[PDB]
Amino acid sequence: MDCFEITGKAYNIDPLILKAIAWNESKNKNGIKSKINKNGTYNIGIMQINSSHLDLLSKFNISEDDLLNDACINISVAGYILASNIKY
Template structure:
């Protein structure tokens, strides 16, 4: 009996954590003017929704956490007390930071797929490859294929920047 009660408590805690993480996408998207499903697509691609550190990139930088925040951003982020450790230990902070980074790219390139490519790479070839991966995941999320993480409310979906993103690719 005690074991089953503990298992129920663990399962309940996991469900609450998953709901909290989902709301992080909605809040971060709203704060920075980014479609929450797009943020989820990026997190899915970057880490499969895990707090991990990726192996070093060719330039020696490292990508951190759910959103794959590149260590090149750490000097700027340190102004707000954001560290590598915090990005790894706080998934919501990581998602919010990813939304901010994407917003920086959107300021430079508009609400286009070029901004999504900018999030990941400087090279046009790498940007195009990344955009293709994100586009596929974003489409799957819109169809509800990852129901475990795609619980964005209908209101948020209705206010998404779908039209702007498509316009940016000619698609």
């Protein structure tokens, strides 16, 4: 199974929803940082996870490089964030 299917299964999110987010945000393109948001933060990788989450993620041994260049990590982190009541 692909990482969208695995992640969707884990967090009870329709995998098509995750794919539609990846498509909207990056056109399913890994390896890219957005231009910097007005608030000075920036969005990372295929699901465009905001840089404000890097602190939390370091506790779990997930770095910025991982989020930017590893699509499956990116996708699984997005799932966790969307499934929680952290602001995305």
